[PDB]
Design a protein around this nucleic acid. Structure first.
Length: 203
RNA sequence: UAUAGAAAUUAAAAAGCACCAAUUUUUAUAAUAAAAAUAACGUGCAGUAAUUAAUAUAUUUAUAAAAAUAUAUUUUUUUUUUU
């Protein structure tokens, strides 16, 4: 266990220098957040809103299950996996299945994320054998991907462009977005090398 | 540029009257070319007041590398508009 070892090193350091410094907390924030359970929970909460009887949803379910198992094995990197996930999410078949599950009313997504937590426990997709149920509780009681009505985190990178155009007011109407260098006075440290994002301010 | 942390962001190319010998000009009256002069091209101290929107066309003034007048186009940073 490297996380308990880093916690032991944090306790020994905080007892040594008798203050809460910036180095040790950054070290244990980097150790406790090395897990890829976020993307596995993304794929499994996308699998939860599907239909176990429809063959198209069976194809999407097996595709996202293979994607999550390839992420947990370390054979596929995170960026290409995110490309695969956003290509599977932006398809109109998955969005139509999510709309049908919204129009149902007695939706099976709660049993979906519960079986997802059981699968992540059984297949070893977590760091601790009982951490998936606390992560399920965290997905339920907080604003997350599980409370979204379509089953993905609500960023504009996971929503279609033809729905992005009439809603949002971006730079010019009728990829990586940048500030053009005509703005010589944008902010204090803002410039052309500072990227901007459509639906969020990451600053 | 800001009702002065412009201690910020900045290469997405804004350009080629005198000075420098591709050349050019003048003349011989009953005598008929060898004498003189001028290079071609682009700058040019022209500024400041924390001065000063820019570009294009036309006209007038010897601050002419300047300045003024008459139109057109562009520049707005989101609290006005949306086939």
């Amino acid at each position: 266990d490297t996380e308990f070892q880093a916690l032991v090193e944090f306790i020994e350091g905080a007892s040594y220098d008798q203050l809460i410094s910036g180095r040790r907390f950054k070290k244990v924030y980097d150790v406790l957040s090395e897990n890829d359970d976020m993307f596995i929970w993304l794929c499994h909460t996308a699998m939860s809103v599907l239909n176990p009887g429809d063959m198209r949803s069976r194809l999407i379910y097996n595709h996202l299950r293979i994607l999550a198992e390839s992420v947990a094995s370390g054979e596929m990197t995170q960026r290409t996996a995110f490309r695969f996930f956003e290509s599977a999410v932006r398809s109109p078949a998955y969005r139509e299945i999510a709309k049908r599950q919204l129009e149902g009313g007695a939706a099976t997504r709660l049993a979906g994320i519960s079986a997802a937590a059981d699968v992540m426990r059984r297949m070893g997709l977590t760091r601790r054998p009982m951490s998936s149920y606390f992560e399920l509780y965290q997905r339920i009681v907080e604003r997350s991907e599980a409370m979204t009505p379509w089953g993905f985190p609500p960023l504009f990178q996971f929503e279609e462009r033809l729905s992005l155009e009439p809603r949002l007011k971006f730079f010019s109407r009728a990829r990586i977005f940048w500030i053009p260098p005509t703005w010589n006075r944008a902010g204090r440290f803002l410039g052309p090398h500072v990227t901007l994002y459509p639906g969020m301010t990451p600053d």
